[PDB]
Amino acid sequence: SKTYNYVYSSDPSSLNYLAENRAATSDIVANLVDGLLENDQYGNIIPSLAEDWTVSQDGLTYTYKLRKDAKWFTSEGEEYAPVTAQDFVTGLQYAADKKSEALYLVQDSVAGLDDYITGKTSDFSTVGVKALDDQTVQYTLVKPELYWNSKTLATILFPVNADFLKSKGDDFGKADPSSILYNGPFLMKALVSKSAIEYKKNPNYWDAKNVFVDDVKLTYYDGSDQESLERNFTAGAYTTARLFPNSSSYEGIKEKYKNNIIYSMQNSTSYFFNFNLDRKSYNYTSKTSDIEKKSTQEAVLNKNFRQAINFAFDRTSYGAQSEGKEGATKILRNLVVPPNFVSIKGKDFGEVVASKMVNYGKEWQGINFADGQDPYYNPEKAKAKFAEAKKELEAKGVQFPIHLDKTVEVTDKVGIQGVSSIKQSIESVLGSDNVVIDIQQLTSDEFDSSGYFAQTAAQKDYDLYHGGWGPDYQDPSTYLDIFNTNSGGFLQNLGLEPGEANDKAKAVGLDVYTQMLEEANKEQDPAKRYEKYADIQAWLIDSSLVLPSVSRGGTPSLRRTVPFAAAYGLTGTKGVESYKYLKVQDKIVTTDEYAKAREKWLKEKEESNKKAQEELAKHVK
Amino acid sequence: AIQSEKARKHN
């Protein structure tokens, strides 16, 4: 058989794909549970559990015909029940009943669902999901959504078996392979905290003919031995390896593999820095007084202060800590919405946003939001913004320097360097008598409990956070909605609770930002809708409530996977996250072999996306 | 979906 071996870094808190919105869960369940549709190797949306589908001429009704060679299996591969249309009724009602953290995906989309969630109704029969028969699912939407079918690639629209739900009770979705049923490409054979995640190909999967690895082993990787990835690839143990140009070894590695180093493209995942606007936990701090803590709570609410940090943050220096100084810019991402995520009038998103910046002051004049460059770093602009921030803050009683807490795993040696680059950059521009980045090195438990796996905003224990967003569906709102005060998926990382809209949120204008998202969402013409979100992204950039840093991709690696064999998706969890369609080979791919395949793939992709948009009309009732 | 920054150092 053929095996794919690599590493992972995030143990999941849960397998509950209906309740979670953390990538740590969806990345795994992508290989274990299928939804209505999935991706091919070119980003087209193709059949999955649903073998055919139609949309009504008004775009409000979506009907899906399910194949009937699709079944649920236990973790050991034993057949449990056939997949049926009722499973999608069960899935959506469950996510609603348990107040899923990804309800923003469907709450304002499925007819009557918002009424059901908020208690304005009690009868799920009024919610727009119906099992017409065992093979037929029908969704009724509030308004037309061209990106609706792309939403079915997110796990909150995945099916679940009601009898298994009843039989398991509160044990469903726990971090145990037996806590869920399986209908996707793989079974999960081992899930051991901080040790390994292991998949076995399900031979009775309905699309087993498209699964080309029989085993997938992911070994836990905590960052303390970065040479482990190349060392294991060279020994024949890993199918791939990400390289670290800053490393001791890279000189020898560079010469040994000079014809094999492959650079990926930047993808649609966007990382950015944010501040904690309502910090309540100080277990990890260097501040020793309450005047310091309150002075920091003040500074992060001041826009001039946030812009000073934004302009004092050297992204090239930051990227060089992980990519070497040659590839330092290859990962730079300068918006939350990627610059080419959508096109308006033939010009893409980043250009339009750069034009909307014209109404947000002198410090944005002629800005360029293209990937692969730093338009933000500007020391003298940072010094001017801080001078105004200090005049305004000192009148409030604020004491300087402003101390800002940033956490990092004590094992993450590359991350320690990146965070040290940020401390060095900001303190170099503004002066350590004005700002001090206090680096907090924590255990894995302290890092997760105060950051990514914290369950409340109050538990966030930092002043500065570095997080990221993966698009859930093909519309700019998947990114920009995450800071809205009603249901923002990222709000807690800012120290705010969705549905509370306290005065710190109003002090930075997030209520205004939220109001703009509401008006932008009502727009149904794509060109305007996108232009309205471009204006919103521009507002967010000027606010500097986020400091866009880097994307995924753009990194060097050695590979024994076949180029462009796996599925690809701009949004969702059925693209690179899935080990379906992926193929391994014996020979280390050469740089020239990958480039020839990329050129072939780029041409096949343009033709395939073309025929796919033409096929769409066949599906209208 | 919420992405951890950690993953980018092996991805």
Numbering used by the authors:
A (entry chain A): 32 to 652
B (entry chain B): 1 to 11
Describing publication, verbatim:
To evaluate AliB’s capacity to recognize diverse peptides, the protein was incubated with an excess of defined synthesized peptides (peptides 2, 3 and 4) that were previously reported to bind AliB. Specifically, crystal structures of AliB in complex with peptide 2 (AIQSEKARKHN), peptide 3 (PIVGGHEGAGV), and peptide 4 (VMVKGPGPGREST) were solved at resolutions of 2.29 Å, 1.66 Å and 1.49 Å, respectively. The three complexes obtained for AliB exhibited minimal backbone changes among them (rmsd ranging between 0.1 and 0.3 Å). In all three complexes, mirroring the observation in the AliD:peptide 1 complex, the amine N-terminus of the oligopeptide establishes a salt-bridge with an aspartic residue (D503) and van der Waals interactions with the neighboring tryptophan residue (W500). The region encompassing the first three residues of the ligands (AIQ in peptide 2, PIV in peptide 3 and VMV in peptide 4) folds in an antiparallel β-sheet-fashion with the β20 (G499, W500 and G501) from Lobe 1, and parallel β-sheet-like interactions with a loop of domain I (containing residues N52 and A54) on the opposite side. Beyond the third position, the recognition by AliB does not adhere to a conserved pattern, as each peptide adopts a distinct conformation within the substrate-binding cavity and establishes different interactions with the protein. For instance, in the case of peptide 2, the remaining portion of the oligopeptide immediately following the small β strand region, which exhibits a strong basic character (EKARKHN), adopts an α-helix conformation within the AliB cavity. This helical region finds stabilization through numerous H-bonds with the protein and is further reinforced by salt-bridge interactions involving the basic residues of the substrate interacting with the acidic residues of the protein (E351, E437, and D443). Regardless, the electrostatic potential of the AliB binding site exhibits a neutral character to facilitate interaction with the residue at position 2 through Van der Waals interactions, and a strongly acidic character after position 4, enabling the stabilization of basic residues of the oligopeptides through salt-bridge interactions.
Given the auxotrophic nature of pneumococci for certain amino acids, the Ami ABC transporter system, orchestrating oligopeptide uptake, becomes indispensable in host compartments lacking amino acids. The system comprises five exposed Oligopeptide Binding Proteins (OBPs) and four proteins building the ABC transporter channel. Crucially, SBPs determine the specificity of their respective transport systems, thereby governing the range of molecules capable of entering the cell. The five lipoproteins exhibit pairwise sequence identity of ~52–60% and share a very similar overall folding.
